[PDB]
């Protein structure tokens, strides 16, 4: 049967404090506890005792009513606290209604798994419970946990604070550890849920027990370091002892400074998790509940001596544990030590205040004010305890505590909502080495309703922080697409899309359409400039100058002819045939123009018509003359005109059908993806049919010319005609394959036409001009 710390009074209030540590592994069945706790144990015991004494001394609170207490150990364990709560029920209930006074309410425990079952046991008998550290979020279900209240906020805000911290410093690939229980587990689920939305990954979650063996943490480090060196941050909702085990195993295995580790309030500002191992933990960032120090307890606590304390059963044992001695004559001598304590050892040596004492005192004050308000609002007729209040009712007390409004010892008004959750604030401490062999926790940031006010300059002391734990660097630099292996979306591989493909999707590119080149930064497509030989090429210049020379000769010749219509040479020859020849040459030399210019809807069509019409409109007169000279060896001028007009009409009809089959148009040729040209729309048939017609005409010409070769008549005209026909046949045969052997077909055709016209001009115009002149 364990010991209890009691203080008599009219009203009795219970409390569960973990004076001893948790039972070690394989010893749970014996329910035997470990070492004594200095800051989570006895400090809270003395705080409760002094607080109740002080509030008893206060006249304005519970007049004529004295308040007692009953403090019991819980050993941070589930079964032990269940037994102690059953003892609370036994002290109440049968032995009290018909032992000691009934227990009004409890204050504790401080863990989110023990408090749950204690509430389960204490909600059947209607005993309110006010916790001070069980900051889990599964205890805010007032339908299932009806008699539970808190003086601290839940951990749905610690998860937000940790997410904001890990996001503010551009961390993306994080590990994950959490101690098994209803504090680490739910908090880590909340962290995962609110981290998925913000685009922050999780390398691999883990789970370990605080009391796990020495060899169960080496495996945890091995599985945590298997991911190295990609994840240099470990997010923890672990308790203090889990972090202590991690630090010890890191020192044993040799990972001093291997990776930063981020922690919760479980090891916020606790010197009892890094003492002796303060070299491994430098860098960690811990969130803490914002609680200023209290001087009442400091003044009262330091004067305590073991020989003058008649209220705390766990004091002398604590004294020999802290100062490592053995009191000679004390009842709990504990002679397993040596070097007995002097009479000069005091508590003000290495004093460290507990980090959650204001919450304890505020919980006690909240219970007292609930009792006082219900007393003054249920029994107004008397100032004290009246028969209408005997016995006290649990439901009325709960409905009186759910409306608390008062100022705590820290100076802040304490009021919690219908869910029983007082508001709170957070600090972000950093563990680092202030001096040589000197280490400390220093305040850096804060947190209140998302206003994370941190110090980027204070942490890492420079612009070179820890290597950002990111699996993939910002690789999509504007010319590479992103491809994933499919196993994980956190980090990816990079594939450069082709030079014809520009970036459209973050994951894939798309090729530009035909006639469009990807831009310089690959953000879009741009129309390729068109290339056409307008005026600057030397070959068009040579063709133009040759055409100009031929045209000047033709105009001079026709002017000379028109000067005197009647002449011996003019009388012998027919004016109609020479006029037809001149018109054909002029039409051809005009067709040389309007083709070298920029193609249009009408210009290219006119050029195509002319290049076919000119040889047709030219050869007709000469073939008629050859036919007449062959017949010699609608008559005369009438016959010549009829033949010329019939041939012209036939050629015009052929050309009309030619461009009826293929209507004129302008097109953009695509010789390659790099270059785009501008051309007129034309068909091979529209070139072949005039070519075949001219070939038939040339065949008739050469046949008739070879027929009448002997005649020296018409001033020896037969030799000139035969030589002209032979030259024209030769050039036609040479120029037929030229049109299908290069990309300069326009220039070749223009040159061939110009020289073909010039040959006939030189053959026929010069002799008659000489005959006119000399």
């Amino acid at each position, epitope marked *: *049967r364990r*010991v209890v710390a009691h203080m008599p009074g009219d009203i009795i209030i219970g409390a569960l404090f973990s004076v001893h540590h948790q039972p070690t592994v394989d010893k749970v069945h014996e329910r035997k506890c470990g070492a004594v706790r200095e800051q989570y144990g006895i400090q809270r015991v003395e705080a409760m005792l002094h607080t109740l004494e002080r509030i008893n001394s206060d006249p304005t609170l519970l007049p004529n009513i004295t308040l007692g207490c009953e403090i019991r150990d819980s050993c941070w364990h589930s079964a032990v606290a269940l037994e102690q709560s059953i003892e609370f029920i036994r002290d109440s209930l049968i032995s009290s209604e018909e032992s000691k006074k009934p227990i009004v309410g409890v204050i504790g425990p401080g863990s989110s798994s023990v408090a749950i079952q204690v509430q389960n046991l204490l909600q059947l008998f209607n005993i309110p419970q006010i916790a001070y550290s069980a900051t889990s979020m599964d205890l805010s279900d007032k339908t299932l946990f009806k008699y539970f209240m808190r003086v601290v906020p839940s951990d749905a805000q610690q998860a937000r604070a940790m997410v904001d911290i890990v996001k503010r410093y551009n961390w993306t690939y994080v590990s994950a550890v959490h101690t098994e229980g209803n504090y680490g587990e739910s908090g880590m689920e909340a962290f995962k849920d609110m981290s998925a939305k913000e685009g922050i990954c999780i390398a691999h979650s883990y789970k370990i027990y605080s009391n796990a063996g020495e060899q169960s943490f080496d495996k945890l480090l091995k599985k945590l370091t298997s991911h190295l060196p990609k994840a240099r941050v470990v997010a923890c909702f672990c308790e203090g002892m889990t972090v202590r085990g991690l630090l010890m195993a890191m020192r044993r295995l040799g990972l001093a400074g291997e990776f930063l580790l981020l922690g919760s309030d479980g090891w916020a500002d606790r010197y009892d998790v890094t003492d002796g191992y303060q070299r491994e933990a430098v860098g960690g960032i811990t969130i803490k509940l914002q609680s200023p120090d209290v001087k009442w307890f400091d003044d009262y606590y330091l004067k305590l001596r073991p*020989e*003058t*304390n*008649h209220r705390n*059963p766990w004091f002398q044992e604590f004294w020999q544990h802290r100062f490592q001695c053995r*009191l*000679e*004559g*004390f*009842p*709990q*001598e*504990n*002679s*397993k030590y040596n070097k007995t304590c002097n009479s000069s050892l005091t508590l003000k040596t290495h004093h460290v205040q507990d980090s959650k004492m204001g919450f304890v005192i505020n919980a006690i004050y909240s219970m007292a004010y609930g009792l006082h308000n219900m007393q003054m609002s249920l029994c107004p007729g008397y100032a004290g305890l009246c028969d209408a209040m005997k016995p006290i009712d649990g439901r009325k007390l709960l409905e009186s505590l759910m409306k608390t409004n008062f100022t705590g010892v820290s100076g802040d008004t304490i009021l919690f909502d219908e869910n029983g959750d007082s508001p709170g604030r957070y600090e972000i401490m950093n563990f680092k080495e202030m001096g040589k062999d000197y280490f400390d926790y220093i305040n850096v940031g804060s947190w209140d309703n998302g206003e994370l006010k941190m110090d980027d300059d204070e942490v890492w002391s420079k612009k070179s922080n820890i290597i950002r734990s990111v699996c993939s660097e910002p690789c999509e630099k504007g010319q590479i697409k992103v491809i994933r292996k499919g196993e994980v979306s956190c980090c990816w591989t990079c594939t450069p899309c082709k030079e014809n493909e520009y970036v459209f999707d973050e994951y894939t590119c798309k090729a530009c359409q035909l006639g469009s080149w990807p831009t310089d930064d690959l953000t879009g497509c741009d129309l390729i400039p068109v290339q056409y030989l307008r005026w600057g090429d030397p070959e068009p210049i040579a063709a133009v100058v040759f055409a100009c020379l031929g045209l000047l000769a033709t105009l001079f010749v026709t002017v000379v002819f028109i000067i005197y219509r009647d002449t011996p040479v003019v009388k012998s020859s027919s004016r109609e045939l020479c006029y037809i020849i001149l018109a054909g040459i002029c039409l051809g030399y005009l067709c040389t123009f309007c083709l070298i210019a920029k193609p249009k809807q009408i210009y290219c069509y006119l050029q195509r018509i002319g290049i076919g019409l000119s040889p047709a409109m030219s050869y007709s007169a000469l073939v008629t003359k050859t036919n007449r000279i062959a017949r010699i060896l609608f008559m005369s001028a009438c016959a010549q005109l009829v033949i010329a007009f019939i041939l012209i009409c036939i050629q015009l009809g052929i050309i009309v059908a030619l461009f009826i089959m293929e209507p004129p148009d302008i097109m953009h040729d695509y010789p390659s993806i790099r270059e785009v040209y501008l051309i007129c729309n034309t068909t091979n048939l529209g070139v072949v049919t005039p070519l075949g017609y001219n070939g038939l005409l040339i065949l008739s010409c050469t046949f008739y010319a070879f027929k009448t070769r002997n005649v020296p008549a018409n001033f020896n005209e037969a030799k000139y005609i035969a030589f002209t026909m032979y030259t024209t046949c030769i050039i036609w045969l040479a120029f037929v394959p030229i049109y299908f052997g290069s990309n300069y077909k326009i220039i070749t055709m223009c040159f061939s036409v110009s020289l073909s016209a010039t040959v006939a001009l030189g053959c026929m115009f010069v002799p008659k001009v000489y005959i006119i002149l000399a």
Partner: nanobody
């Protein structure tokens, strides 16, 4: 509260030996230091011996030092005092006491008493 019961005392010839047994009720006996006191008619109460709650430390009065032995057994919930040589001053009534919030010996703040036992020593 837990009750204390005494046994083993009586009348014996001087120079003999005896064993005095003190037993406590309840189940919280493992956390209570136990003191042996004496009281003779016509004089004020006097101290005899003491044993710590955890054991392993014994306190003997100077007047009886070197001849009396004390031991405890928590399993059967008792403390035994082996008394030897039957000194003439032993003819008195012996009390058993329990203290837990004590100070340096012999100041122990006893709060639980017992009926004791009368031991008479012949001449």
């Amino acid at each position: 509260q837990v009750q204390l019961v005494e046994s083993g005392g009586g009348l014996v010839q001087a120079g003999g030996s005896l064993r005095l047994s003190c037993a406590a009720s309840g189940r919280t006996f493992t956390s209570y230091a136990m003191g042996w006191f004496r009281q003779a008619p016509g004089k004020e109460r006097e101290s005899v011996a003491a044993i710590s709650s955890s054991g392993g430390s014994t306190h003997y009065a100077d007047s009886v030092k070197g001849r009396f032995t004390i031991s405890r057994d928590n399993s059967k919930n008792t403390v035994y005092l082996q008394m030897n040589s039957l000194k003439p001053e032993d003819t008195a009534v012996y009390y058993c006491a329990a203290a837990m919030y004590g100070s340096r010996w012999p100041d122990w703040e006893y709060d639980y008493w017992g009926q004791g036992t009368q031991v008479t020593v012949s001449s």
